[PDB]
Write a protein that binds this ligand. Structure first.
Ligand SMILES: Nc1ncnc2c1ncn2[C@@H]1O[C@H](COP(=O)(O)O)[C@@H](O)[C@H]1OP(=O)(O)O
Length: 214
């Protein structure tokens, strides 16, 4: 009788969202104007001057930003029911957390921010079994992220997949030397239109763990 949320996750406060939102926009402009990116557009899009990444990532989160833990679809998603049953979930419901943003990334499909979860937060991370083939050798929670924008033709949960793809390269020493220096950190060109800004100082955001029902 009692149905679950659309998904659980950490929803940022109004200011943490505004700060992170603004930060993401600066990156999409700094990256768009960087000559290292403009000479690589052939790997990003298949058409043609300069591209404005902000407009490119037109499908943005309208309200407050968030970090999804477990997509439930009101209980239809596999493992949704077992996740909500967890004591840590019910105990943590409505409680405040601080999330650490380590990097900002961009791909032909998505623009997001990498979240590094603490051990207590990892307790709220789902350990469902029907895994991806992208999480091999990566620690659980690596997928943790905040979506800042999607291209027009992109599916949801793509931002999470893109991140894992990026981190798989970093693990394989395939990230390469930095191709630039932005005021917030070092810029990286990972090829295939993938980019990463490793923040000098990790950005902390306040958030509330809860459920979205839409
Ligand atoms: N099958 C899914 N698995 C995991 N996360 C999902 C899934 N479907 C949607 N989401 C995520 O839950 C939220 C639902 O948003 P939407 O309104 O588009 O359905 C999004 O943050 C999305 O992740 P993401 O932010 O990477 O797109």
């Amino acid at each position: 009788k009692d149905f679950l949320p659309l998904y659980f996750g950490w929803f940022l406060t109004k200011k943490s969202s505004e700060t992170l939102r603004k930060a993401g926009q600066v990156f999409l402009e700094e990256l768009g104007n960087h000559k290292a990116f403009k000479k690589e557009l052939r790997h990003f899009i298949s058409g043609d001057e300069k591209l404005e990444l902000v407009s490119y990532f037109g499908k943005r989160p309208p309200g407050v930003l968030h970090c999804t833990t477990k997509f439930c679809d009101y209980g239809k998603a596999a493992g949704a029911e077992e996740y909500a049953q967890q004591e840590v979930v019910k105990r943590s419901y409505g409680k405040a957390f601080k999330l650490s943003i380590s990097a900002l990334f961009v791909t032909p499909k998505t623009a997001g921010a990498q979240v590094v979860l603490t051990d207590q937060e990892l307790q709220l991370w789902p350990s469902d079994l029907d895994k991806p083939s992208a999480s091999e050798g990566l620690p659980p929670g690596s997928r943790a992220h905040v979506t800042l924008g999607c291209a027009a033709d992109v599916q949801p949960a793509q931002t999470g997949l893109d991140l894992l793809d990026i981190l798989q390269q970093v693990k394989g020493g395939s990230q390469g030397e930095a191709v630039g220096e932005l005021p917030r950190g070092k810029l990286y060109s990972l090829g295939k239109g993938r980019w990463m800004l490793s923040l000098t100082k990790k950005m902390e955001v306040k958030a509330i763990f809860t459920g979205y029902y839409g």
